[PDB]
C-alpha cells in the first residue's frame, strides 16, 4: 500500500548489485540511516523512499560508485557521459564525506590497498589492520582510532600522496574546500 511502482525499481537494483557492492550502499547511506534497516539490505532503500530523500539522480550516483555502467543504462537509462554531466555541478544527496571515501576506494586498486596499509602501520603502530580488509573497511577502521575527522583528514592526503596518487589528493581538497563557508565561522 503506497509502495507505488517505484518499489519495483528499487527491488531491481538490489538484486543487480553484487554481495560485495551492496556493502557500499550501506556505507554511503550509513550517514542517512544509522543502519536501522533490518538484516535485509533491500529494506535499506525502502526507508529512504519513505523519508522522501530518495532522488532518481541519487541512484545514478550510487550506481556509478560501484562501477556499474550497465545498470545505469538499464535502470535509469543513463550513459557514462551522463555521469560526468551529473557530477559536473557536483550535486550530492548526502554529505560528500561518505561519497568521497567510497569514490577514493573505487579508484584505488587491490595492490594500492596493500601499499596503503604499510604506511598506516607506521602511524597506527600495528593496530587492527589486515590486507584482507577492503579500502572501505579501512575508512571506518580509522574512525575508531580517531586519526581522521570530517573537517580534518590530513593523514589521508599524506598516505595517498606517497602512493603517488595526486588525482585522489585533488578530490580531497575539493571536499575540504567545500567543508565550510557561511554555515559556521
Swiss-Prot record:
Domain of life where this protein originates: Eukaryota
Region feature (Interaction with FADD): 6-177
Domain DED: 6-77, 96-174
Positions of the UniProt region annotated as Interaction with CASP8: 6-177
Protein name: CASP8 and FADD-like apoptosis regulator subunit p43
Gene name of this polypeptide: CFLAR
Whole-protein coverage range: 2 to 173 of 480
Amino acid at each position: 500500500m503506497g509502495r507505488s511502482d517505484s518499489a519495483e525499481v528499487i527491488h531491481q537494483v538490489e538484486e543487480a548489485l553484487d554481495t560485495d557492492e551492496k556493502e557500499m550502499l550501506l556505507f554511503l547511506c550509513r550517514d542517512v540511516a544509522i543502519d536501522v534497516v533490518p538484516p535485509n539490505v533491500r529494506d535499506l532503500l525502502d526507508i529512504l523512499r519513505e523519508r522522501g530523500k530518495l532522488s532518481v539522480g541519487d541512484l545514478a550516483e550510487l550506481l556509478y560508485r560501484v562501477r556499474r555502467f550497465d545498470l545505469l543504462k538499464r535502470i535509469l537509462k543513463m550513459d557514462r557521459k551522463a555521469v560526468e554531466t551529473h557530477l559536473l555541478r557536483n550535486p550530492h544527496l548526502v554529505s560528500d564525506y561518505r561519497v568521497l571515501m567510497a569514490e577514493i576506494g573505487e579508484d584505488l586498486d587491490k595492490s594500492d590497498v596493500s601499499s596503503l596499509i604499510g604506511l598506516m602501520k607506521d602511524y597506527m603502530g600495528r593496530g587492527k589492520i589486515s590486507k584482507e580488509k577492503s579500502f572501505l573497511d579501512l575508512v571506518v577502521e580509522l574512525e575508531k582510532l580517531n586519526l581522521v575527522a570530517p573537517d580534518q583528514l590530513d593523514l589521508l592526503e599524506k598516505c595517498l600522496k606517497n602512493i603517488h596518487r595526486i588525482d585522489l589528493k585533488t578530490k580531497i581538497q575539493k571536499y575540504k574546500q567545500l567543508e565550510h563557508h557561511h554555515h559556521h565561522h
